[PDB]
Design a protein around this motif. Structure first.
Motif, short mmCIF file in Angstrom:
data_model
loop_
_atom_site.label_atom_id
_atom_site.label_comp_id
_atom_site.label_asym_id
_atom_site.label_seq_id
_atom_site.Cartn_x
_atom_site.Cartn_y
_atom_site.Cartn_z
N UNK A 99 -8.47 -63.34 24.79
CA UNK A 99 -8.47 -64.35 23.74
C UNK A 99 -9.13 -65.66 24.19
N UNK B 223 -11.57 -66.04 26.08
CA UNK B 223 -13.04 -65.92 26.15
C UNK B 223 -13.75 -66.35 24.86
N UNK B 224 -13.03 -66.35 23.74
CA UNK B 224 -13.64 -66.75 22.48
C UNK B 224 -14.01 -68.22 22.45
N UNK B 225 -13.30 -69.02 23.24
CA UNK B 225 -13.53 -70.46 23.28
C UNK B 225 -14.14 -70.91 24.61
N UNK B 226 -15.19 -71.72 24.55
CA UNK B 226 -15.85 -72.23 25.76
C UNK B 226 -15.16 -73.48 26.29
N UNK C 61 -17.91 -73.94 17.57
CA UNK C 61 -16.49 -73.98 17.89
C UNK C 61 -15.89 -75.32 17.47
N UNK D 152 -10.31 -58.04 20.29
CA UNK D 152 -10.50 -59.45 20.63
C UNK D 152 -11.89 -59.66 21.23
#
Lengths: 12, 97
Positions: A7, A9-12, B9, B78
């Motif tokens: 999970x 890894x989705x955010x930098x 993001x 995921x």
């Protein structure tokens, strides 16, 4: 391998 | 690592009612968030409810969860970053890109 590992890894 | 650009993001979003309720269940305090915050709470939600598979923790099961109704799938990986974002966008309105 843990859910949070993947999970995170989705955010930098 | 991430398949989503950092700039994306940081997109500011206004979650719809159902998604909003889900985020607030884990501490969310606002009406608008950046995607990064949406992803944070969503992770906490899944982790807390143990929706992931114990053996292959990147597999999440949501057929019997509000998350399933929100994503429109019984389960997902995921590792599919773009797919997760796509499912998330249908549950919110983009404020500022």
């Amino acid at each position: 391998l843990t859910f949070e590992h993947w999970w995170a890894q989705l955010t930098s | 690592g991430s398949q989503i650009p950092a700039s994306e993001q940081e997109t500011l979003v206004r979650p719809k009612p159902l998604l909003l309720k889900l985020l607030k269940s884990v501490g969310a305090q606002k009406d608008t968030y950046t995607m990064k915050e949406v992803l944070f709470y969503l992770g906490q939600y899944i982790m807390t409810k143990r929706l992931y598979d114990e053996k292959q923790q990147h597999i999440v099961y949501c057929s019997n969860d509000l998350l399933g109704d929100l994503f429109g799938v019984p389960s997902f990986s995921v590792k599919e970053h773009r797919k997760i974002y796509t499912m998330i966008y249908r549950n919110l309105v983009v404020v500022n890109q």
